[PDB]
């Protein structure tokens, strides 16, 4: 009797995923980085190495980054030694904090993504969390429902430990869910702790080092949906493209490992180096089916790993500086969020050119692309649209 | 100049996500549960604990679970004492123990799979990885796609520390995957291991206890596509339609939280109640619309988190005792593999139905529904429909 293509029919969306509100938080506690290496060897009772804190100085004058925005706080840290050592057992403890940050941040977020978005709660119907600080069950996507009081039958997707590339992976989730579903609105959260991975410094890890140098905190989220309600929703940028790949050559380039001592953070191969020798292939895959092959003449927004990427990625290409303003403003403000990032440079992007009269949210260009990078080695590719004024 | 609603209309597929492959697998070590309760308070050292004892034989007895698989050995856990303790810091032997398992079996699985499907593994352009049992960074995902041999730019789906409702979550997540992408070809891999929750027994943690008698290790995997090839794939179910909500007044129900002695498992209310108090809920949402209200006219698929909550579904629903055949046939071969389990009883009833010659791979019914259960207390509803022969 029944028709499932007719079902199928009148179950989908029509028009491209949409991102109809952004959203962001951080901690409350501002740490400057011109004064970092000193308060993190302090706090770690590491002075006496001194060779190593003149390197994390180096590190830290190098990284492009004036502050960043922590949970963690010098009493938190002095009431937890063992996460201020560089190995010792801390899970317990981290996760203690970080399963209870993570979403309390993440709705802070979420409140002010709904407030622009300007619709009922109770029409999301997707949820995606992502995260890479924690784990729990129920996870922090049942959290945020519960904290948000999003509807109990909310549609969730937790993706916990994943990376930084994941705020590509949250963005190509979030538009199958939107696209594949008639009326779906997807709210989106990506929130950052560095509590899992806080950790003293050791001079045979300075790959560890040079996490402590460039991880912040942060959440962000979005609403996502397609066929939005003109002149009562308020498109911001389109989804258009996605695509997730693996570098060749990258085998053990970004690692973390979740043990008794809390989240590990290794780095085994040249970073910045694999980026560059592999971004132009994702970008001749997103564009050249769009006849586009001058790069400058897109708008840009790369996951801010370290300056190093931004810079090879800039040489590689022959990018003029400007194109990645609005990813090294956020490194500058809030260091590597992870997941978070990207979105927050999105946030940054549209609102400079709406706030400088601009003929697009996409610096006043028509087309975009956004990268994720992280453990794979992976890249995550978005092909986004902006929209007018 | 390019126009999106073209890319959007060519980008898409046409018809219902479909199931074109199963196959599962399991660890090696088969354990009788009948001589379970001997086994495992010699192994933990617990048999002056007589009377918890006593109490887990029932437990055992009373399971309607024959046999589990379980890649803890008598020899792994002689040289664990940690992993044997109630409560000891043994998270980084487990973890090492399931970083390589989880993709092991899950390997085994999906090779099954990929073999029944038949078409070149270089056809597939999605993978979702589903496990409760450990985490890593890289993740059981790229782990996965290295041991296949899938192509690099395969776009992953990495899901962990979900829970037992996570079965039914990646066929929610497949469907839009598969149904919004012209061509895409999931794979699909849930792989299990209770090597992150064995525990030794407490008398004041008798909800502990009942995880020791009815989780078992598996790995299920499905290819699911749009739009199947005639007369080259081989359709065996397809989804209409899902959903997931959290059970009124079943806070805190089902409970795990990863820790440095691994993860715990707790059980705080009435599963069994909360499930079948809500399940007439989650079937007229599903099919009332369908114009269906005579629920053993469909067939089933419960995850069976325990038999009481079976046995309570059946009783409230006045389910005909062979509904549940394929599910009981499951629990009792296997015990609770969490996310894998439905994906096994998805497997014994379309072999059952082909191999006895009945008319749909539906125990010759048209229409059925699988159901998910987990920490929330939440239930993940699909839609089925069979196919013919």
């Given at each position: ?17 949409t ?31 001194t060779?190593?804190?003149?390197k ?29 050592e ?34 009922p ?28 009081g ?57 790959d ?20 939005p309600?003109p ?5 911001i ?21 979740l ?5 590990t953070?290794?780095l ?42 931004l ?10 500086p ?68």
């Amino acid at each position: 009797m029944v028709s499932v293509s007719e079902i199928r029919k009148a179950q989908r969306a029509e028009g491209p995923a949409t991102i109809l509100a952004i959203g962001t938080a951080n901690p409350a506690n501002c740490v400057e980085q011109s004064t970092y290496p000193d308060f993190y060897f302090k706090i770690t009772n590491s002075e006496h190495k001194t060779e190593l804190k003149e390197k994390f100085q180096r590190m830290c004058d190098k990284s492009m980054i004036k502050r960043r925005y922590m949970y963690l706080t010098e009493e938190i840290l002095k009431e937890n030694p063992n996460v201020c050592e560089y190995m010792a057992p801390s899970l317990d403890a981290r996760q203690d904090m970080v399963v209870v940050e993570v979403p309390r941040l993440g709705k802070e977020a979420a409140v002010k993504a709904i407030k622009e978005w300007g619709q009922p709660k109770s029409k999301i119907t997707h949820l995606i969390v992502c995260t890479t600080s924690g784990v729990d069950m129920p996870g922090a996507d049942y959290q945020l429902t519960k904290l948000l009081g999003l509807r109990p039958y909310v549609k969730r997707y937790m993706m916990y430990q994943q990376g930084c590339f994941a705020g590509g992976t949250v963005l190509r989730l979030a538009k199958d869910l939107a696209e594949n579903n008639k009326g779906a609105r997807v709210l989106v959260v990506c929130s950052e702790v560095t509590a899992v991975t806080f950790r003293g410094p050791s001079d045979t890890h300075l790959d560890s080092l040079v996490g402590q140098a460039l991880f912040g905190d942060g959440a962000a989220a979005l609403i996502v949906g397609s066929d939005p309600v003109p002149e009562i929703e308020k498109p911001i940028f389109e989804m258009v493209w996605t695509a997730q790949t693996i570098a060749p050559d990258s085998e053990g380039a970004i690692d973390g490992h979740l043990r008794e001592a809390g989240l590990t953070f290794h780095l085994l191969k040249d970073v910045p180096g694999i980026v560059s020798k592999n971004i132009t292939k994702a970008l001749v895959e997103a564009f050249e089916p769009l006849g586009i092959s001058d790069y400058n003449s897109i708008f840009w927004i790369a996951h801010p790993g370290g300056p190093a990427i931004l810079d090879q990625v800039e040489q590689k290409l022959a990018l003029k500086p400007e194109k990645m303003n609005a990813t090294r403003e956020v490194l500058s403000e809030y260091g590597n969020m992870s997941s978070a990032c990207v979105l927050f440079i999105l946030d940054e992007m549209r609102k400079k050119s709406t706030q400088n009269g601009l003929k697009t949210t996409g610096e006043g260009l028509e087309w975009g692309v956004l990268f994720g990078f992280g453990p794979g080695l992976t890249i995550e590719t978005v092909v986004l649209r902006s929209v007018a004024i």
